[model samples]
Target: SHMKSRLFIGNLPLKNVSKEDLFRIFSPYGHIMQINIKNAFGFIQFDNPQSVRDAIECESQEMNFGKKLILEVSSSNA
Candidate 1:
């Protein structure tokens, strides 16, 4: 299940987002297996379904660090 357990999180403003920052935002959901932040995109791995659900249910519309950000959960590989 490790292969399918992964998730693709994109549309992020890398200029303002960091792996640690993303972890802080998503850690509340569940155990984060891994996090990868790219130039303008990233990926996050959740240990359980509840965490994914919690992230999706988060009320915060936009996450900002130094610039605007657009976050979306996807299953596609980066």
Candidate 2:
């Protein structure tokens, strides 16, 4: 199972989307504890930390979507 945490999120697929709405789109990827969404993107604080490498790989494996929605551990802390 995939789940991860958050320092920040950038260039999400939509604008003005809510934290509640993100669950519909992102819940499949991981189980989270704290998730906060902003106008551009959002951040996820998952229940566990083991998935951090997977999250980074998730971003590397993706294609399409201009500018793309990237997933990674924040260098600032995590």
Candidate 3:
């Protein structure tokens, strides 16, 4: 079921990372609905699930932002 389009970015090195930085980093994958940054984490919501899939394909498993960030589906409730 490829429906989820929201991603959770955790362990962010917020000291140097900004919302704009995230926008630049992820925009290539898809059109983002919104980006929300918290103390040390953030959420990236995309316009489509395919973008989320591509994002995970490239960044979720191998790459790391600031060598600390982790990306995953925001939730699994449904």
Model 3 segments more than 4 A misplaced: 14-16, 61-65, 76-78
| Reference-based lDDT, each prediction | 0.62, 0.57, 0.76
Give TM-scores for every candidate, taking all chains together and pairing residue i with residue i: 0.65, 0.55, 0.77
Error in Å for residue 78 of model 2: 12
Q: Give the least accurate 10-residue stretch of model 2, judged by summed lDDT.
A: 59-68
lDDT of 3 by residue, 1-78 (tens): 436888778877657666787898899999887888788778888877778778877886544565545777777322
Cα lDDT tens digits for candidate 1, 1-78: 344444456556535566787787778777888887777666678766556656765723655464334444556544
Clashing residue pairs found in predicted model 2: 4-46, 5-44, 5-46, 6-44
Greater TM-score among 1 and 2 belongs to 1
Model 2 error, position 54 (Å): 2.1
Model 1 lDDT at residue 77: 48
Any idea how many clashes model 1 has? 0
Considering summed lDDT, which 10 consecutive residues are worst modelled in model 3?
Answer: 60-69
Q: Per-residue alpha-carbon lDDT of model 2 for 1-78, expressed as tens digits? A: 333345356777664656775565455566766677666766777655554555555554454244455667754333
- What TM-score would you give candidate 2 relative to the actual structure? 0.55
Rate residue 63 of model 3 by lDDT: 46
Q: Find the candidate with the highest TM-score and give its number.
A: 3
Ranking by TM-score: 3, 1, 2
**Segments of candidate 1 deviating more than 4 angstroms:** 1-7, 14-16, 66-73, 76-78
Instruction: Candidate 1: give the clashing pairs.
Output: none
